Design a protein around this ligand. Sequence first.
Ligand SMILES: CC(=O)CCc1c[nH]c2ccccc12
Ligand SMILES: CC(=O)CCc1c[nH]c2ccccc12
Ligand SMILES: CC(=O)CCc1c[nH]c2ccccc12
Ligand SMILES: CC(=O)CCc1c[nH]c2ccccc12
Ligand SMILES: [Ca+2]
Ligand SMILES: [Ca+2]
Ligand SMILES: [Ca+2]
Ligand SMILES: [Ca+2]
Ligand SMILES: [Ca+2]
Ligand SMILES: [Ca+2]
Ligand SMILES: [Ca+2]
Ligand SMILES: [Ca+2]
Lengths: 199, 199, 199, 199
Amino acid sequence: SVVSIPINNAGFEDPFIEVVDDYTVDTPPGWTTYNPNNLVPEKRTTWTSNNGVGYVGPGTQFYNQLAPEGRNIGYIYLAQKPGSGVAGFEQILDATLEPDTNYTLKVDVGNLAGTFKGLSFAGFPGYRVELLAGDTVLAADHNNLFIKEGEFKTSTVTYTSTAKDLHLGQKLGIRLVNLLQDKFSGLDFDNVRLTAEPT
Amino acid sequence: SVVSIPINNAGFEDPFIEVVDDYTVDTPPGWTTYNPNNLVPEKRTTWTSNNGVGYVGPGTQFYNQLAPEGRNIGYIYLAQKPGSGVAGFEQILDATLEPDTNYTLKVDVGNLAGTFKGLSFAGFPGYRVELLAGDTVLAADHNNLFIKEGEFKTSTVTYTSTAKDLHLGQKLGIRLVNLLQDKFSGLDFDNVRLTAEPT
Amino acid sequence: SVVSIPINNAGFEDPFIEVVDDYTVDTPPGWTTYNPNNLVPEKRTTWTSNNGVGYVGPGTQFYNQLAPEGRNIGYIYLAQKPGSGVAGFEQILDATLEPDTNYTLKVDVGNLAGTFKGLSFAGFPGYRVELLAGDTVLAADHNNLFIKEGEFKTSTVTYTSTAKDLHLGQKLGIRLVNLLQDKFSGLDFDNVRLTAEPT
Amino acid sequence: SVVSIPINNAGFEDPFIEVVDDYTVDTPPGWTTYNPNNLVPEKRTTWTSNNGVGYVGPGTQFYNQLAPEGRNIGYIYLAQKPGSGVAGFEQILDATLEPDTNYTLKVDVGNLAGTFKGLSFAGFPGYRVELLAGDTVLAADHNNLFIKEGEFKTSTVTYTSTAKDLHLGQKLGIRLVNLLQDKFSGLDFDNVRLTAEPT
Ligand SMILES: CC(=O)CCc1c[nH]c2ccccc12
Ligand SMILES: CC(=O)CCc1c[nH]c2ccccc12
Ligand SMILES: CC(=O)CCc1c[nH]c2ccccc12
Ligand SMILES: CC(=O)CCc1c[nH]c2ccccc12
Ligand SMILES: [Ca+2]
Ligand SMILES: [Ca+2]
Ligand SMILES: [Ca+2]
Ligand SMILES: [Ca+2]
Ligand SMILES: [Ca+2]
Ligand SMILES: [Ca+2]
Ligand SMILES: [Ca+2]
Ligand SMILES: [Ca+2]
């Protein structure tokens, strides 16, 4: 009776990227930029904070594995110094919070590795994965997993609704957040999945 | 190889309380009131927002069990309506963040049950347990456990430091947070423990 | 007496670039990539050898002046080590080599300055500017100017045709070449101009 | 603070030639034959590519002036058709490239005029003058000057070293190149001078 809640572009496979380690610098289709501190500008460049999709394919210089799912990951890179705020991806779903339901949200989180011409990718900014109803964070994993350089790990967030939950009927949502707690302050997400099961 | 990090009044056993289901309305010794939204006044009653310790002893009216540890729990009760903000307890420790270390923070979180003077304690405000270095939240459990009316369940929060962590040498800290996401908007904590071991 | 020979996209003003210091990684329209050593890949990323246009605008991090002309410059960046070859821009013109004519080719050449997060732009690869007829290099300036970090200088290349020049009647051409003699091995060009004067 | 850099046989005065318009067919002492395309054979004759020195003295048949310097010039004659490659003279010096130094190389380049035994010396193959460090061309004048039939003109090549030049400490060199871009495909050089000056 476990049911899949549809998420748009849940594995960041849109758009198709042809070249390994190439990437876009526009919000991935189906998602919005979560930007409570306005860290990410509307027009992004190499020199600014940005997010988008990237192709982790054979020959990749960033990971010791391929993408958790398909070709692509979704990334958020913050140029501002640690402590400046947070940003990432948000998506509000069509499904709504239902009573006496177990919700299970899984997302792979990646720590990009390596080096480019004096730029180091060592380090990680921390992550948070949030399940929302309306604009309440029902449950979140704030940086509990250790993610080695050049790997992805699956974050799992759980929530059980009761028959009289205040947020019943409000739209579900997901946020994938770069915490900007350290540098290199880029991190990746992939393979977002949300299931619901009668309790 | 697992080491205990000292925490003051980690079980809220101070002060001693004589009578079952009695309680204080002042910040527990060794803790401060985490009050980022000004919900808890300096001068409390039983009918303002408050915090304190409570004796969950034999035949308690609020739980199906005794305190997780010793006689007492620590409680936070917020009178303001859901969504007004958060508050709880904070303690800054003497130990500082060390590299290549796996930190494990555990706290028992209680969901009060029953009905007292015509007030129902049905419902739960949501919790967050935070592990700090300095004023940074390294890791947190934001409301992932499902806690039935009248029971405690253990929250586990984990952080792994690296060799170059920006926060090395900063004081470790703990926050125990009432999220005020619903009513009844009181919750309990007990048996705070923090360990460290080589990664 | 002196006539301007038209050149397409002679100031790299196509495409339009909105944000200061942003750039493209594709061959600018009207030009081709001069690629005698195959150093520049057909499909470029931020990480590969590349060419394109770059907006040298108010508040540029790269120069102590604005673009020699308009908004943009044309750049060629080579990732391969010094000595691996050359690459740049080429444009074959409609104009043909006429007798008893003094040709004067000028181009501004830029030595990009600064740093970004560990990337260093100190150093300069060397330049060569070539005037062609057909496949023949009639005249060239191979790296005679000294160009300080963060400025542009005008290179001038001259050829005088005789009554019975072998190449008479063949199409004129221009090449702008990154010599890859040192690092940082990026350099910029702007404001290409070619004049013809009967002798 | 400008200094002369010693060059051997810098005016091609060795060997002494007694009879006006007589010449040698062997590589001038102190120079080597620059031969990247094998156009000049080890054993030279009448109908072969050759180099040598030539006495441009009173009443010379080939010029409207005496030699730029002393009695002789150095010549390079290439018998192969235009486009077959290049050849000329090379000399590696004892001086090495030093930092923060302005180098100025000057060379007189000659366009032979007239007739010799029913053969027209009209036309000119083009020249290139190169300053080297090791086997890197630091700077060159590729054919920028216009040289009338029967005259010499001074080519000036300049290079400026920085503190961190990749080629620091390598031996300076000079190349004087016949480009074989047209016929009559002989040219002459004289009076090679190289100066260095702290920048
Ligand atoms: C290097 C960055 O943090 C931004 C680009 C990026 C972040 N993650 C990626 C995965 C595959 C290709 C590109 C990327
Ligand atoms: C009803 C409250 O939230 C305040 C008192 C209280 C909160 N939790 C308790 C546990 C044992 C005894 C008293 C208490
Ligand atoms: C920094 C590089 O070498 C490639 C991009 C680039 C080279 N030159 C530039 C001028 C303005 C904006 C960007 C550029
Ligand atoms: C074109 C030639 O006669 C080859 C020898 C030569 C080339 N240039 C010269 C000038 C004076 C005397 C002889 C020569
Ligand atoms: Ca994917
Ligand atoms: Ca990393
Ligand atoms: Ca206790
Ligand atoms: Ca309750
Ligand atoms: Ca321009
Ligand atoms: Ca530079
Ligand atoms: Ca001489
Ligand atoms: Ca001639």
